[PDB]
């Protein structure tokens, strides 16, 4: 591997800790980086470190390098997982990225659901709660991250609350935007770690015609809005792949969540326009969401 001094961190400056990943986005450990920034070299930063498994192939290594390379080209934004450094020389490749202490958006929302009642699946009682303005702010931050990625000509292809990470400061950060586009596939029947089907976030033209655009990421963002307003709800529970295809061919759309305004449901429906050119762009969604955040009550 060739050395890039823009990103090189000496190996003795990384203190590897507990695994974080294989929960989702590859082989990942939590770590402490000493002196990531030149001002100063005496401070530690908790970081996430992406690396290869023992049974990794030449394609497994080339995909990690490409993801790292893509992150360098995309550059920095507050609403994406940023690249912080790399250990490329004299040992296993380590890709150092931002650590989001509150986990993914689906987990974060589920843990903040209102307390369990006598009819619930009843002991659920968080010490953490979200207002309607907080939920709209979450949607705004994801749209901002996507608008930035789109401005850098990046098409995500897998936007979902599972790929949005939450920092200690409740900042939303889009993850997995730099992953290498697989060829051909993918397995429509392959489930996530929590038993969900990624096809449930895919635009019909991406699913049926294999056409991925910024417009198909806007469809995914509509499903992500639905995930926000259901506080981490699962789209189409109990619906297998073959039945989802039939619902899509019939123009079926998910029902309005109860914790949602008519305006926000019409935003979801607009993201789900059958005609890709008719969907709002991320630039429009950012503008609409900024206006809505300012008018949404934080009193309930
Ligand atoms: C308190 O619970 C949790 C706290 C933190 C995590 C977590 O994984 N954080 C994480 C993962 C990455 C990363 C970003 C991009 C690529 C690879 C990894 N950055 N930050 C998971 C948790 O529960 C499962």
Author numbering: 465 to 585, 587 to 765
What's the publication's text?
FGFR1 is a membrane‐associated receptor tyrosine kinase which plays crucial roles in human development. Over‐activation or amplification of FGFR1 has been found to occur in many different cancers including oral squamous cell carcinoma, 13 breast cancer, 14 and lung cancer. 2 The protein kinase core has a bi‐lobed structure comprising a smaller N‐terminal lobe and a larger C‐terminal lobe connected by a hinge region. In many cases kinase activity is determined by the phosphorylation status of specific threonine, serine or tyrosine residues located within the activation loop that is situated between these two lobes.
First, to define unambiguously whether the compounds used in this developmental study were type I or type II inhibitors of FGFR1, the X‐ray crystal structures of the FGFR1–ligand complexes were determined. Of the ten compounds tested, seven bind to the ‘DFG in’ kinase conformation (compounds A to E, JK‐P3, and JK‐P5) while two induce a ‘DFG out’ conformation (Ponatinib and Linifanib) (see Norman et al 20 for relevant PDB numbers). JK‐P3 and JK‐P5 were originally designed to bind to VEGFR kinase using the in silico de novo design programme SPROUT. 22 Both JK‐P3 and JK‐P5 were also found to have cellular activity against FGFR1. JK‐P3 and JK‐P5 were designed to bind in the kinase hinge region of a ‘DFG in’ conformation. Specifically, the indazole (JK‐P5) or pyrazole (JK‐P3) nitrogen atoms are involved in hydrogen bonds with the backbone carbonyl of Glu562, and the backbone amide group of Ala564, whilst the amide NH forms a hydrogen bond with the backbone carbonyl of Ala564. Type I inhibitors bind to an active conformation of the kinase, in which the activation loop adopts a conformation amenable to phosphorylation. This is commonly known as a ‘DFG in’ conformation due to the configuration of the conserved aspartic acid‐phenylalanine‐glycine motif present at the N‐terminus of the activation loop. The type I inhibitor with the lowest affinity was JK‐P3 with a K d value for FGFR1 of 25 μM; the weakest type II inhibitor was Linifanib with a K d value of 37 μM.
